[PDB]
């Protein structure tokens, strides 16, 4: 299909290869093409990728696709007529298959078959009644399936995999004639008998037959009339069109069986061949678990009779059939499923079997090798035998019995003219020999000293006969002899190479004493006749041995090997990957002794090591694909361990670099010209465009012959750059000048600025800069300046036309763009590497200072001009092109997509449009695609460049001065003014987008880059001062006014909801306004400004400081108030009707007012200017005054050490005689203007204070402060903000404050309630006003009047109107603040001792009024206002602190509708809050005084007993949030008489808070009469309501996912969420409710027990069973299973898990005061009665569906889960329920839930349930698995006789209620005094005096199951079981012992099964039945139980002996019984 960028270059280069061959076929007529194909049977070269044949593939597809449509065989996913039963014509058979025939040959020996694409056409070639074509098609399909799972491929499902009209087709093709049969008078009639002269065909098959519901059949001799075509034609008519496929399958089979024609046997061969191929494909695609019975079950006699064909010779079987059978097993053995079975069927565990015998036969064949010598069949063998050996435990049984000594005789043959196999056999031996074990056996058979004597003969014979050497004919080669011999020698060399690395010493010695060393040289002698790979292995052999042996060199010195290598180094290298990456170590060896080292220093070795990178071919192969960097890393190693070579290496780098500039030739092009109009761009928005078909982008920088060189060389340099090395010296020998030369070529194309090379050098130059600072900075900046200056044509052209589109169509265009790409590259490199804020050094910016000082400000103007022209340039193209295309050529989608960065916002399609790329493109697009691409990056870089030197010291606070600082301000100024001139020009009308871009740029540069964690921006201060004082904000002020009128005049508009900035005149017309006002505000804010406090020690010639932040704030504030007032005077705002303003501009202006009245602390008279030019001792002094005599020190000395006020120059004292008569040159300068500009001019009048404090009053008494009520009706949304401005206004001035709220309310009553317009927002205004702290105290009279108003006229029907939520919100505030812990104050000599600080006041509402509200509140109906219900729940929850109110809530019916309101709205977000509040309310209901006391006592007692004087009161009380507020009185009472407060203090007045530990004296308390009253409460209908709602929701089709989810596969985090399908969340919510309530509150169970559908009455009506049954039986009744759907599975699993959770929690024990104790054991008198009912429900379900086999077929699903609940019950553990239970209380739980289970004998129950489970059923294993652990769980505990769902607990749920409302975690102060009334009064007085005073005066092997069950348990260990499972059986059997009554019988069962059972086939059954008869005790073998078609005695014995070993490995006492006399 397509590959990554770099690989495409290699593919294209290789495409040149096979140029003659590809042309040799394509440029030919089709008849020749077929004749050409029938010549390439064999392949004499290496593997050739399909990509080169791609055109051949397409030609074949076209050639045959026509035939496919000729017969309409082309099927469709829409049309389903299939095909008429006509088989493809005889003549075309060869034509159709021959082309396919070659396809198999190609696909076999080729590589990377992935890119094959014509696969889908094969299905269209399916549906072919003829078989031969079918056989070939399925054969190609088999090879393709190999491709699918050769290693791993299950992708491109739509191609052939997903298509479901193929899986069934191939399955039907399989299972046709199946395998051998069960004929009566015959064992099996193995298919192989078809050819022997013995048992005849099973005539049964010789009869036509077919039925579904149709049916047809005809006996043989009835098919002799109709032909195949006639048979098919007659049949089709009756049966459906969708049918006839099986008819085609079986009719031809019957016809073949109908006679004995000579071709008939060929037909049978064809059909069987197709069958094995189909089996291969089926196993290829289908998973083992399915095929286990999907196909194998239908045909069980498959593996048998398969190995019957692959042995050898057997001159009856078709060799083709043999090969096909070989192939299938190769596919099967890929996985670890059928391996062992294959071995057993073959016999690869005992010698003289099959495997180890056909090898003997092959050895016999090769020894003579004169007939029937096949090798394609042989290689597959060694392949397979390697395939088995991967499965580690399946080749130990191959090493044993003798394998190596059988292959070893296949090798060692001499004069073999069949050297093909030996390569594969050697490869197999290499693969097999891995461990330390087999190596020893190999040698001891004298294999070593066989290869090193075969290779010598091979090599010497190689040069003997030139009549050999028939090399390739269509390829690029380096050997030119013959491929096979090369492969053979390569394999032998590989094997020796591997074996050289075990012990060495022996191998080296054996190597010396042999004619191999002299033979090896012959290879290097002439590579023109051997090839290039061989030298790789030869040199590796040489390199490792010398390293292995240091003292072996001299022997190598002679024989001519080494001297030949050194004197020929530049005679071996070539374009091979491994070879090139192998040089560094080889030279690391030749220099292991001083002679070699000296020769290397001489002889020019190193120099040749480098170089060869200047030719494209050599540097390509490495391609820097992580291969090249290895070269660099290695090179350092050589120098790393050889210091003497340090010098020479660097010289190589220096020389190579200097030569590289040479080639660098302009090669291809920049752009193209349009096919018409001869223009490079467009002219009109409307125009016609042609289209082409290729990559949407050109993708240059590759195939250029220079980019590859740059990539490779830069990669090598980067690799060597790592760590350290000689690279640190290249700067020494070289100079920075030339280094730059290699980068920044003359003519780079557009994309050059995006490649690894630039990125790679981006890292290298950092390293050099990190050490050698003053190396490559000034020269780089010089190059930048020179390149900028070299551009003058368009850089100064007029700024009102398209320069590029002004000279289009002429060659001058290329010249223009050329330099642009180079400039882009230069900027890209410079911004990243040198100029960037992240990299700032105190020694760095000094370079900038010195550079600008010595050069000046020259590039600044050029940069500004470039920025102006660029943006301006990128508009006319937009304004003259078919805009639709603008999205096609959109440039942004390239690396560095950080939209943060000024220049791009014109999107003409929504951001989520998609890709929409490459939809339409042509030559015009490509030119435009580039022309814009450069400009974006150029502009982006320019802005960062502008910022970088706009911070200087302030970034690091370097504290400059003198020359350093002096320039700083000059850079600032020469930076600020430049940008203004851009804005001054470029008038508004005509070009708006430029205005937006420029404003964005200003906001960009003037704003500090993203800094701080969240602080968006700290506005630059000194730049702001320069901007203003030079004239700033007055440029915007005019733009603001123009646009303001430009918008208000617009034709009500709907702008509230908008996004996706576009060219709709409106949005642009306003888009500026947000940008402008935002920036304007940023200045005024006292926080979004950096502190640059100066003037002090900056301008010391004046008074005051006029701090540049606080003072600068003033003039801006003075400004813009005039425009506010002017607009107000006009009919603009704060007047009129309707809204004529954008929604956000109010938010903006409103914030300004808050700022405009934000006085911080300042009053100003005058401000002075920072005019560095005259700074401290100025520059003008040296310019003129202290010029003669240059008194630099003296003049400065006088100025500083004495009066610092330049008095000018005269000749009064200490002056030269010539000073006067020469100084007389001046009129006026720096005398009165010496002080910088104090104030030049302003906007209206004055700007330094005192314009404020007089302009405020005009507005203060003009508009909103008395006119909001008129405007507010027209702007309700922002009411949130209106108050803020009013509060700010009223802050500074006098304090009417609450008078405003009073005037409000006086307007509220007059609201004329009927109107839902003013009241709705007005109450919210009041509330937000009331929320404020300081305005609370003096508002009591207002709150009561509000209460009185609310009481009457409320009309509880008033719930369906907007003016309800906010009213209840204000009431919520009032109430919550009201009913705090009631106010309490202490007395009676409290002994304050630093008394408490006291607390503020509150307003406790009157008692009776609340009663009315509640009586007016709890009555509603048909609520449908979401927010209203949200408010109702919130208000109601607070009253539940009482009890009788809770009773009324229960018996109110409000919940009965508030619940269904949940289902009314489920797609909204805040349903979360709604459900949380409702759950808290419901949980609060059942709460009763009984539970509260126990839970509180548990909480406090735990606190004063743990250990993280303890428990500081001021800390615990703050963490008792969820506590106390529930019932402060009860918390006091329980905590009163305990904790015995200590620390009475010396005087008795407390000086501490922490109390004493748990009560030191304790107390006695009692309480009862609730033990029987814990339940009852007459069943408040809550539980019935919830259960009924769940029952209703159950049958609501909670399986179908929502109709559509749009781009669900384009999600963000994870799909398959259980949410959506609102019912699921609804049911999830209800299950949460139940699983919390039932386990939490005790009384809830009774209701869950006494369910019904009619709410029957009377005391304890009757314990029913309609709820447990529902949770077990009814739920999960949905019939589903429509194929595979993860959504369905996930939903089912979640709901089932929750169901199990609830049922398990049913029986759990509720947490209570039973904590922090020991427990022994007790039975809950009530719960226990519930326990038995719970279990009793389960046991009945077991008996049912067990008997009545039919009821045992449709109940396993229920049964599956069922047994699991028992496990999860005996375990006190549930999927989610882990933190809702009392852990220390789980002791008795297991005890009781084991004893009760034993009473009914559930173990005894299960085994009976386990019995009767027939093994033949597929679920057999499944259901056996679940129970076995259950018994183990029961026994294990018995040893003691002596997705993202969140759930919480009781104490935890209170915290949510505490924090949702009032949050301040200090309200305990409301009760802190209260506890004091008894905290110490009688605690630290009575106990202390009574104690302290007087103290100082004196100072079972029980039967666990039955005798017929364990026998039934022995029904185990018979099914064909895998490993791991056996573990649990061992644990059970070992633990099940100690039952003395069973220990005797347990084993006695087995020994019998051994002695009598495993003797033959007809013995096992006669004990399997007996053990069965011992399970369902009745008679003795009154009926036969069939065996499960498996379990041969070997398997039973295997499992049985395994288990026997297991048992005897555990029981110290078992051995004794093992050896004895039974005593009968």
Numbering used by the authors: 2 to 213, 236 to 1074, 1076 to 1532, 1539 to 1872, 2220 to 2276, 2450 to 2574
What sentences appear in the manuscript?
We performed single-particle cryo-EM reconstructions of two Tom1p constructs: full-length Tom1p that contained a 20-residue tag including 12 histidines inserted between residues K1074-D1075 (Tom1p^His^; physiologically active in all phenotype assays) and Tom1p^ΔAD^ with the C-terminal Protein A described for intact Tom1p above ([Fig fig2], presumably inactive). These structures were determined at resolutions of 3.97 Å (Tom1p^His^) and 3.07 Å (Tom1p^ΔAD^) for the dominant closed ring conformations ([Fig fig6], 7C, S6). The two maps and structural models were very similar to each other, indicating that neither the internal affinity tag, the absence of the acidic domain, or the presence of a C-terminal Protein A scar induced notable conformational changes. As expected, the acidic domain was disordered in the Tom1p^His^ structure. The structure of Tom1p^His^ is very similar, with the exception of more poorly resolved density at the UBM domain. The Neck is followed by the Body domain (residues 507-2,888), which comprises a helical repeat solenoid structure that forms a ring architecture and leads into the C-terminal HECT domain. The first helix of the HECT domain, residues 2889-2906, helps to close the ring by packing between the HECT N- and C-lobes on one side and the Head and Neck domains on the other side. The Head domain largely closes one side of the ring formed by the Body domain to create a basket-shaped structure, while the HECT domain is positioned to one side at the opposite, open face of the basket. Mutation of two residues in the Head domain at the solenoid closure interface reduced human HUWE1 E3-ligase activity, suggesting that the closed conformation is important for the catalytic cycle.
Tom1p is a large, 374 kDa member of a broadly conserved family of HUWE1 factors (also called Mule, Lasu, Ureb1, Arf-BP1, HectH9/E3^Histone^, Ptr1, Upl1, or Eel-1;). This family is characterized by a large N-terminal domain attached to a smaller C-terminal HECT domain (Homologous to E6-AP Carboxyl Terminus) that provides ubiquitin ligase activity ([Fig fig1]). Tom1p has been implicated in the turnover of excess levels of small, basic proteins including ribosomal components and histones. We determined cryo-EM structures of Tom1p to reveal a helical repeat solenoid architecture for the 2,888 residues preceding the C-terminal HECT domain and an overall architecture that resembles the published structures of HUWE1 but with a larger fraction of ordered residues.
